[PDB]
Amino acid sequence: GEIEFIESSKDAGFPVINTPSKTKLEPSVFHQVFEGNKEPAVLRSGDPRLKANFEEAIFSKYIGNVNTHVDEYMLEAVDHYAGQLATLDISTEPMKLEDAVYGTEGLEALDLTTSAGYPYVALGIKKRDILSKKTKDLTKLKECMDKYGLNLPMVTYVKDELRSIEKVAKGKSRLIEASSLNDSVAMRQTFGNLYKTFHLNPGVVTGSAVGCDPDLFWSKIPVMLDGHLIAFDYSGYDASLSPVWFACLKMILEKLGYTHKETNYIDYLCNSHHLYRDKHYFVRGGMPSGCSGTSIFNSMINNIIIRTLMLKVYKGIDLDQFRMIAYGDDVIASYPWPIDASLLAEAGKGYGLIMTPANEVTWTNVTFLKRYFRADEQYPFLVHPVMPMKDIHESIRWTKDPKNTQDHVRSLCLLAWHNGEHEYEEFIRKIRSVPVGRCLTLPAFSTLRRKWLDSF
C-alpha cells in the first residue's frame, strides 16, 4: 500500500476529527506485584517518550506497491484455494438486514461501542442513536443509509494498547480504520454469509482461524497439520499488500459466485479515502484494518500468497497435500516434505511482502496467535494453548477501567492455567498479595482443568 495524496482536511471542507489524545490505560493495583516492560502506545506527537517523528512513524507501514499483473503462479493458487472453498457451498445471496446488523448464528451483532465513522462522527451521532439492541429497529438505519449513501471516507484512529519499549520509542503505534456505519452494514449484507461460513468452519478447508476458540481448536490443529510444520508471520502485512493481491481476492470471490458488481467493495478496501485528525489522504493498496471483514479477507489473501510462493519456488509442488491455517498475517501450515521457509520469504519480498519465518519448526517451538502448543500429559490427544506467563503479566499490570477488574483477572486465569499448576498457583498467590485480589472470585486450578476436559 502507498499514500498517494495527503492534504489539510479544511481545504476539502472536512472538519477536524477530534480523537482522544491521552491513553485510557493506567497502572492497575497489580502494577508493582508483577514484572513487565510494556507501556501504552504513543498517541500524540509531543509524547516525551518518542525518539522518532510520530506522524512519519505511524504512516511508515505504507511501504509501497509492486505493480504487476496476476501471474501464472497466482492464477493457479487462486484456482487451488477456490476448489477448497467450493466444498463449503458459500451463499453469495445478501444476508438479510436484521441478521447482518443485530446478530445471527456465526455472525455476532454489529459492535455498538465502536466509531460510527463519517459523517456521523462530525455530527455527534453515535451508533446507539441509530441502532437499538432491544428493539432491533432498522428504520433510522435505512434513513441514514439512504441519506448518505456508500463509499464514504474512513476515519483513522491510533490504537490504544500496550507496546514494547522499542515500539513506544520509535512511535510505531498501530492504526485502525473505522468504515462508515453505512459501508459496514452494506459489506455485512454483501459478505455476511461468507463471514458466517468462515466463523463456523475454522480449519484447513477455509484455511482460517478467525473466530476460533483456542481452548477447543488447539487440539484439532495437529490432527489437521500432520506433516512437516511451516510457520511464519509478517512485518506490516496489511499495509504492505499491493493491489495485485486484491485483484487475486476478487478473482477468488467471482469463482465463488459473486458478481463483478458484488466484488466492487473489494475496490473500496484497496483504494481508500481516510480522515486522520486534521488531514485527509488517499491510499492505493493496503488492507484498511478495522473495516468489515479485514481479518477474514487478510486470511483469504494469505492463503493465495503462500500457495503462490510455493508454486513459484517449488515447481512441481503438490498443493493437494499442502495444509494451512491463517489468522490474518499469522500462518501455521504443513507439507509432507521439508520446505525452506527462507526461500519463500525471499520470493515474497519480490511481491512487496515482508515475511518473517518461524531451524526445525516443531510442535514444541511453533506458535500461532502468540500461543504455544503443549499436549496434555494425561490426555495426550488434547492440546493446551499456552499463552506465555510474561504476556499475562504484561496485561494484568494495566487497566482501561478498574471497574472491570473481576472480568479482566478471570479472563487471564482462563489463559494462565494452561501453563501448569505450579505456575497457576504462583499467579494466584501474587494476585492475592494485593487486597483487591482477595475480593475477587478466582477459579480453582482443578475447576478450570475439569471444565476444559469436559468441554470436549
Automatic annotation (TrEMBL):
Ranges where the RdRp catalytic domain occurs: 227-343
The residues listed in the UniProt record as binding Mg(2+), with positions renumbered to this chain, are D233, D330
| Subcellular compartments | Host cytoplasmic vesicle membrane; Host nucleus; Virion
Q: Which family does it belong to?
A: Belongs to the picornaviruses polyprotein family.
> Whom does it interact with, and what assembly results?
Homohexamer; forms a hexameric ring structure with 6-fold symmetry characteristic of AAA+ ATPases. Interacts (via N-terminus) with host RTN3 (via reticulon domain); this interaction is important for viral replication. Interacts with capsid protein VP3; this interaction may be important for virion morphogenesis. Interacts with Viral protein genome-linked and with protein 3CD.
**What is the role of this chain?**
Protease 3C: Major viral protease that mediates proteolytic processing of the polyprotein. Cleaves host EIF5B, contributing to host translation shutoff. Cleaves also host PABPC1, contributing to host translation shutoff. Protein 3A: Localizes the viral replication complex to the surface of membranous vesicles. It inhibits host cell endoplasmic reticulum-to-Golgi apparatus transport and causes the disassembly of the Golgi complex, possibly through GBF1 interaction. This would result in depletion of MHC, trail receptors and IFN receptors at the host cell surface.
State the protein's name: Genome polyprotein
Q: Which residues of the full protein are shown?
A: 1724 to 2185 of 2185
